[PDB]
């Protein structure tokens, strides 16, 4: 699983604490503040096709990082929405072709009216512990994607979007 981010980040296999850098994409949904799009930046595939299948399941413990400590939201992991932090484990994402398809969105539940947070570059934005599972054998991995931020855009903490 040696894929890349759209900006060109080198993602190594089995590096545990992963320093992978993505781009922020803020928007607004009803009751949701779209912090970041990992789908439109992380396009992946399988490194050794026709014999293995990349299943990714989000392992427990994961919240936001950096300055955000008591802040929680929602994850869109392959269409349907789930809470974030992890009370459970989301369903899998199938990877079976050599095609750079989108991989997931993070949303924030509004506490203020229209307020926001400033994010610096090199600050942590995801503490995501993942799990890569094959199909031939019932095994499991342990990667800690310490996802940081590249661009600095104002992610809203309120019920609307200010731009």
């Amino acid at each position, epitope marked *: 699983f040696a894929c890349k981010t759209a900006s060109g980040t080198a993602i190594p296999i089995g590096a545990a604490s992963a320093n992978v850098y993505v781009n922020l994409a803020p928007a607004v949904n009803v009751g949701q503040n779209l912090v970041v799009d990992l789908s439109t930046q992380i396009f992946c595939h399988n490194d050794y096709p026709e014999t293995i299948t990349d299943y990714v399941t989000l392992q427990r413990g994961s919240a936001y990082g950096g300055v955000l400590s008591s802040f929680s939201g*929602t994850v869109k992991y392959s269409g*349907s929405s789930y*809470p974030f*932090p992890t009370t*459970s484990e*989301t*369903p899998r994402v199938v990877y079976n072709s050599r095609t750079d398809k989108p991989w997931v969105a993070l949303y924030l539940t*509004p506490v203020s009216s229209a307020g926001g947070v400033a994010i610096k570059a090199g600050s942590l934005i995801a503490v995501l512990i993942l799990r890569q599972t094959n199909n031939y054998n019932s095994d499991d991995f342990q990667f800690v994607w310490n996802i940081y931020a590249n661009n600095d855009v104002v992610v809203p903490t309120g019920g609307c979007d200010v731009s």
Partner: antibody
Amino acid sequence: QVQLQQSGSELAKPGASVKLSCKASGYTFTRYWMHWVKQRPGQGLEWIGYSNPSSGYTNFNQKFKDKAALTADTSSNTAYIQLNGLTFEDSAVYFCARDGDPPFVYWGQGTLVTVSA
Amino acid sequence: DIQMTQSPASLSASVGETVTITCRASENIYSNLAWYQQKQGKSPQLLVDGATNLADGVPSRFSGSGSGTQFSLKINSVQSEDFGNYYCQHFYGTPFTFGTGTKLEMK
């Protein structure tokens, strides 16, 4: 102290539509999710689904996909579930609980709904 | 969408003795199991978190163990005030369904 309590026994008729109660106080209602339980006497505990107060989105079960419509009132801090088209095997007691923090176990005595012809 | 079997249906428990409750799953569930303690006519409560971590408030007589597919619960020196039902519930993938249940009675 975080606790839940619920409505009384409602007896009704099949084919009707009714929305139930799960009353709460003393905790932040919209920043942590809630889950639902159905108790069948002689069978056991079964899982219903979970809904968001803020976004309004709900993940259902396959059985409760068209059975229930799960909302959660942010202002009144009351967890809601409505059911239309009652059947003879739906006479049961519902339980409501919390989702979020590691523990996330806060429980109530349940809403008992029974229907007969 | 997975079916899960808790074993057994019922067993007899005395005072000053050890009981074992076995929770078996088909797929390798990734340690997202919880043990729920139900009373009669009363609101149920938890015992442990993740079948490895004790919840805060109850003493250490209750003990969960196991990971993967085999999940077990050892209870020693059980007393009269905790007679009820045990529900081992899995949390891997929607739906997060409960178990069948385990019934406890006076010996």
